RNA sequence: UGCACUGCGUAG
RNA sequence: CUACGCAGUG
């Protein structure tokens, strides 16, 4: 019973987290542009996520996706923010190359916002 | 026999590198975990103990 | 020479080879081909692909082409072959539109289709009343469906005006449905297919009607979008606050089905914290080079990365094995499994395999009465829906999910829902779709392999729904004693034997065979699953509805079939194939095995000659089975339980969820009346998608000797009591790994090592006696270190230690 | 740190 | 029979 209730608090201020960290600027946009108002959840957060994270696995796939500090997917354009590696350290964007490849801690995880 | 407790060594000492932190290096830890599954994987003694030479040195350097 | 032909008459009937401008191949060889496939004889298939440009006679030359999983690169040289069938679509179409001009009856068959499409036959052709013309395509269609997918023949119609040259189709993002689609898709190609075809399943009048629908489906999804499949998730206001809420849901199979109790308590928090569709808005945006799956979004602001930790090693056991003359060098027993560690992209990369389910379309003719034929195996079995206070949980302290594993066990969300709110969510899950996540687990288990396992914890609402639906059958599968499936069923006290016996039960010229499925749990096509669904399913005839069933369906094939997969903080969308954590996995997997050996049979049948066969029996059940596959739609029972009785003579089969053990027929196989090795492999290649190697598949002469293996553990014959008995053992190699290799280091030593020996102990006995002496002297190993460890701790410990105790479990007495 | 089956050990 | 722990199988 206790626990039961700890379980409905913990649950409703998840809910209530993720809907503080939930924009509806884009949401309704979308929500009124649909006729029936249904739409895919996958659309959702490629239409509305202020922040995308991409995980390169070698430095081929970097240069063919993001080689620039601003590159376009999803029909939109993201600027690099940030580039770490597999170990949480923060590498510089000059330091990728084809050259220093071998020293860095692949995959390296590259977070970027919307532009 | 010289295998089986090359075998035995190599496990003892990826167990003792893991509990050294060794782990939070990604490459390192990939290395020493390659070697070691080729280790318990290899037919030939003299491919295993040069496996095992190179992960002793790997403990050896830190 | 040979050519293949698809003959129906009163003298004979089947698709098989026979001795009998226009081009050299027909579309039947080619289907004859794709369906009966062998490495050995692949003249005509390599013959076809190269005359028509889809690869050169080098890609031949390299070993291992035709395999997926080693070259995958062969899916795009069949690729390179898909219009070319495509457009011979169409033209039948044409040709059965002037068929019905003239006033023609009669029946199409693929050998008399050309490769380039043009049909040359007009034979068995009456005329009749103009306008009223109605050709038979049943034989045609349903054999030519397997190719379809596997050449992607409609992968033009994702392109602006169905052409391979223009752009793609850029469809609305937001656009969900596609049952205008559908329909134009069907009516283009399959126009003459008589039998309705509904977009959604949620207008099938009955389970067949499930399976067709969804077999169609299947193959028109291809060209829809892959984003606009999953959870329909609405904006909605609740208790003045705005929350996003999953409100349908889109299914390759099964089209799209919306929730009957959409409305804008523990239950509905429960709800609310399963459906991905709160965490998929909160979460970023991803993009994951390391895999070819469908990325959703990142939960974490970090990616994360899971290692597996190096095996602890006992020094004390193998010091005295080493000391007793074990592990000594040329000795036949050696360690050869270990605990292997595994580096941090080890987890994604496993999940990568899931690349090898791909979209199968099924013969679905063959499939209906393959399915009939399997629900005669569960026709003893009793089931139906329980209510929450008759539902057993074996561990209440497992996992509960994502998300439920932040706040508790398994055993807070039972205590916490009493059994009328379990009844409740029970009831809205027969009138609603719940989505749920599921995560992947490294599995953490000795292995002769290097390669990671992954386990798939699903969440808990689906645990408890699926416990509630299937328990009562699933329990009635387990005390069962010598039926088909096995499940439940101690080896000891002499159960092997009894299954062994059971195996062999009246078969005229017996031998043993056994195969291997690979990557069965990946590569498992979706049509097969839901079939096995169906199957469990159909003991709800008088406890459930046709909706309630449905809706038990749906909420299964979004919950284990296509859910969404928590990895390393990231969300992903399961291409298909079955999860390892579901509450059906071992009995679905066993109707899978069943339904492809019920397969591989009727394949093996059809294929022969027919006038060879120097039976009369044998051809009547051949004609029949044809007049009931391609020919007659209602379910003929009579046939159903003559086919069945056939196989139960002569194919008898022990089936444990993966593992098949067939005692079978010698001439009956030689002749080609009953399914070999070859045909299995043939089944697994056309449906399954996947190679099957003799390597890994044995057959056994004599049945003194006994399976090969099976779980693991093989067979011999020994003397107890002057009776001779079939008794399991172990490979010596597993044991001695188990022994001197242990999981954490809390089990190291102490009281706890006696239990785990004396399991071991349990399992090794049977070594004793095995001719080789090292077998037996693993027990003899074993038995004195149980000593020591005893002499070291310090009159009924004695029983430990005597071999009487481990003598009295392998008797029959209990 | 998953779903089932089987067999053991300790308390009642 | 129930509670806990262990081992094997898919
Ligand atoms: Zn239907
Ligand atoms: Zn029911």
Redesign the pocket.
């Known amino acids: 019973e206790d626990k039961r209730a700890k379980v409905t608090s913990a649950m409703q201020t998840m809910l209530f987290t993720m809907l503080r960290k939930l924009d509806n600027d884009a949401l309704n946009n979308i929500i009124n542009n649909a006729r029936d108002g249904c739409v895919p959840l996958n659309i959702i957060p490629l239409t509305t996520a202020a922040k995308l994270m991409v995980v390169i696995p070698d430095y081929n796939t970097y240069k063919n996706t993001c080689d620039g500090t601003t590159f376009t997917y999803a029909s939109a354009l993201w600027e690099i923010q940030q580039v770490v590696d597999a170990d949480s350290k923060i590498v510089q964007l000059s330091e990728i190359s084809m050259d220093n490849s071998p020293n860095l801690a692949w995959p390296l995880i590259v977070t970027a916002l919307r532009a | 026999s010289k295998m089986s407790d090359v075998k035995c060594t190599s496990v003892v000492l990826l167990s003792v590198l893991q509990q050294l932190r060794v782990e939070s290096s990604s490459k390192l830890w990939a290395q020493c975990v390659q070697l070691h599954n080729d280790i318990l994987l290899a037919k030939d003694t003299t491919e295993a103990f040069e496996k095992m030479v190179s992960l002793l040195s790997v403990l050896l350097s830190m | 020479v040979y050519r293949a032909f698809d003959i129906y008459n009163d003298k004979v009937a089947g698709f098989a080879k026979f001795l009998k401008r226009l081009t050299k191949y027909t579309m039947a060889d080619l289907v004859y081909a794709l369906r009966h496939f062998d490495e050995g004889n692949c003249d005509t298939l390599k013959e076809i692909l190269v005359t028509y440009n889809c690869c050169d006679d080098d890609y031949f030359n390299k070993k291992d082409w035709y395999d997926f999983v080693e070259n995958p690169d062969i899916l795009r040289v069949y690729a390179n072959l898909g219009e070319r069938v495509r457009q011979a679509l169409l033209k039948t179409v044409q040709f059965c539109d002037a068929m019905r001009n003239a006033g023609i009856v009669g029946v199409l068959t693929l050998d008399n289709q050309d490769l380039n499409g043009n049909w040359y036959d007009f034979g068995d052709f009456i005329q009749t009343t103009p306008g009223s013309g109605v050709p038979v395509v049943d034989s045609y269609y349903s054999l030519l469906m397997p190719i379809l997918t596997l050449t992607r023949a409609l992968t033009a119609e994702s392109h602006v005006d169905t052409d391979l040259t223009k752009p793609y189709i850029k469809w609305d993002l937001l656009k969900y449905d596609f049952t205008e689609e559908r329909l134009k898709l069907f009516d283009r190609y399959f126009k003459y297919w008589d039998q309705t075809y509904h977009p959604n399943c949620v207008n099938c009048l009955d389970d067949r009607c499930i399976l067709h629908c969804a077999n169609f489906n299947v193959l028109f999804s291809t060209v829809f979008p892959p984003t606009s499949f999953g959870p329909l998730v609405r904006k909605i206001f609740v208790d003045g606050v705005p929350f996003v809420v999953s409100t349908g849901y889109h299914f390759r199979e099964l089209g799209v089905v919306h929730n009957q109790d959409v409305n804008l308590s523990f239950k509905e928090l429960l709800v609310y914290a399963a459906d991905p569709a709160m965490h998929a808005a909160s979460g970023n945006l991803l993009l994951d080079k390391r895999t070819t799956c469908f990325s959703v979004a990142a939960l974490t602001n970090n990616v994360a990365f899971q290692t597996v930790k190096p095996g602890n090693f006992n020094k004390d056991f193998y010091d005295f094995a080493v000391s007793k003359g074990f592990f000594k060098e040329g000795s036949s027993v050696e360690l050869k499994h270990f605990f292997f560690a595994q580096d941090g992209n080890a987890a994604i990369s496993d999940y990568d395999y899931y690349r090898y389910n791909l979209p199968t379309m099924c013969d679905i003719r063959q499939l209906l009465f393959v399915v009939e034929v399997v629900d005669k195996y569960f026709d003893c079995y009793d089931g139906g829906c329980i209510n929450a206070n008759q539902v057993i ?7 509960a999910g994502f998300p439920f ?1 932040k706040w508790g066990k ?1 055993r807070l969300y039972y205590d916490s829902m009493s059994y009328e709110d379990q009844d409740a969510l029970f009831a809205y899950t027969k009138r609603n779709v719940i989505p749920t996540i599921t ?1 992947m ?1 490294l ?2 288990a ?1 292995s002769a392999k290097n390669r990671a396992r992954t ?4 969440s808990i609402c689906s ?1 408890m729904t699926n ?1 509630q639906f299937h ?1 009562k059958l ?2 009635s599968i ?1 005390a069962t004693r010598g039926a088909t499936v096995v ?6 006290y002499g159960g092997w034997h009894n299954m062994l016996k059971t195996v062999y039960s009246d078969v005229e010229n017996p031998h043993l065979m056994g195969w291997d499925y690979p990557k069965c749990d990946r590569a498992m096509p979706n049509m097969l699953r839901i079939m096995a669904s169906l199957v469990l399913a159909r003991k709800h005839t008088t406890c459930c509805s046709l909706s309630h069933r449905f809706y038990r369906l749906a909420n299964e094939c979004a919950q284990v079939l296509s859910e969404m997969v928590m990895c390393g903080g990231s969300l992903y969308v399961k291409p298909g194939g079955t999860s ?7 009995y679905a ?1 066993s109707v899978f095995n069943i339904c492809q050996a019920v397969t591989a049979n009727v394949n093996a049948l059809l294929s022969t000659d027919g006038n060879k066969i120097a039976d009369k029996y044998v051809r009547n059940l051949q004609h029949r089975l044809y007049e009931c596959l391609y020919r007659n739609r209602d379910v003929d029972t009579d046939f159903v339980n003559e086919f069945y009785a056939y196989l139960r003579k002569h194919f008898s089969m022990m089936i ?4 098949a053990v067939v005692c079978f027929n010698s001439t009956y196989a030689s002749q080609g009346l009953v399914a070999s090795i070859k045909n299995f492999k043939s089944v697994l290649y056309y449906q399954n998608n996947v190679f099957m190697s003799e390597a890994k598949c044995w057959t056994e002469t004599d049945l003194t000797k006994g399976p090969h293996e099976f ?2 553990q093989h067979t011999m014959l020994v003397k107890q009591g002057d009776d001779y008995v079939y008794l399991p053992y ?1 490979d010596p190699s ?1 044991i001695l790994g ?1 022994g001197c290799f ?2 954490d280091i809390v ?1 190291t030593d102490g009281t ?1 090592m006696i ?2 020996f ?3 102990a ?2 090794a006995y049977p070594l004793t006696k095995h001719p080789n002496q090292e077998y037996a002297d693993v027990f003899h190993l074993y038995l004195q270190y149980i000593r020591k460890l005893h002499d070291e701790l310090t009159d ?1 410990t004695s029983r430990y230690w005597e071999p009487e105790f481990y003598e009295a ?1 392998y008797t029959p007495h209990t």
């Open positions: 949980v074996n561990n209440l302290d497992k996992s594993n398994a995560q687990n599995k953490y000795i386990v798939a914890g699903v645990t416990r328990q699933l329990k387990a499940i439940g069923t101690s080896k000891f390892s954590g579901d509450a059906t996995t071992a997997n444990l969820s993966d593992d779980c693991s172990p597993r188990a242990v999981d089990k706890l239990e785990r004396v399991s071991l349990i399992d009924n479990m």
